[PDB]
A paper describes a structure:
Like other hCEACAM family members, the hCEACAM1 IgV domain serves as the major ligand binding surface and is characterized by the presence of two anti-parallel β-sheets creating two distinct faces, the GFCC′ and ABED faces, respectively.
To understand the structural basis for higher-order oligomerization and clustering of hCEACAM1, we solved the crystal structure of a tagless hCEACAM1 IgV domain at 2.2 Å resolution. Taken together, this oligomer crystal structure revealed simultaneous interactions through a primary (GFCC’-GFCC’) and secondary (ABED-ABED) contact at an atomic resolution level thus demonstrating the presence of two adhesion sites on a single hCEACAM1 IgV molecule. Notably, molecule (b) showed an additional interaction site involving the ABED surface with an interface area of 482.1 Å2 which was mediated by interactions with molecule (a) through residues located at its respective ABED face. In contrast to the GFCC’ interface, the ABED interface did not involve hydrophobic interactions. Specifically, we observed that the GFCC’-based interface in this structure exhibited twice the area of the ABED interface. Consistent with the central role of GFCC’ face in dimerization and subsequent oligomerization, we observed GFCC’ face mediated interactions between two oligomers that enabled the formation of higher-order oligomers, wherein molecule (a) of the oligomer present in the crystal asymmetric unit mediated GFCC’ face interactions with a symmetry mate of molecule a (as) of the symmetry-related second oligomer. We therefore determined the crystallographic Debye-Waller factor (temperature factor or B factor) of all three molecules of the human CEACAM1 crystal structure reported here.
Residue numbers in the entry:
A (entry chain A), B (entry chain A): 1 to 107
The structure:
Amino acid sequence: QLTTESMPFNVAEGKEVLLLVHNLPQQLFGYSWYKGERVDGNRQIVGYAIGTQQATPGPANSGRETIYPNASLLIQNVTQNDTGFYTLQVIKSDLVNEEATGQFHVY
Amino acid sequence: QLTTESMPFNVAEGKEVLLLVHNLPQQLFGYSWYKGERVDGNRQIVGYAIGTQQATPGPANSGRETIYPNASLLIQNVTQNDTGFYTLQVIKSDLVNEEATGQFHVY
């Protein structure tokens, strides 16, 4: 049931897009966002620990993103290579974790 | 650097296999094991929270597996459909998580 929608879907180069999260579960340890349609550490954008409120960037961090405490992801100054899928993984306290995929298109 | 090796690699139907974990990082919240070569909640075997020492089964749990506190995974009474890839994800305190893939073959 966790979902993400991009706002806007079609984004103009140089403008911004918000990946808005819906149905965020409770009893969470943290968030991890990835570029592409799969959880993979080689393409992690950012890790975020809820208790300490610490964001840590990953290999796919571009320096134009902001993760908020509700797990939504802002990307500013979009370029053509931002186009595609993004994957949010949410880590539950029982370690039975949940993923959701979003997407947007830069024109 | 996290890795997993199956012992034995080639496993006889009805016998057991241990997915032994190496280089387990420190400062971990938990473990999640998956069937297949990717982290995906629809194929989660088990979630394990280190602090409370609780295992919770996922959709791909067969009832023949045991995860230990060092993250190694025993599978007993193997069948032909156990053949293939397994994926361990390790959740770090900074949420910049690590994955490793193992495999074995049932003959």
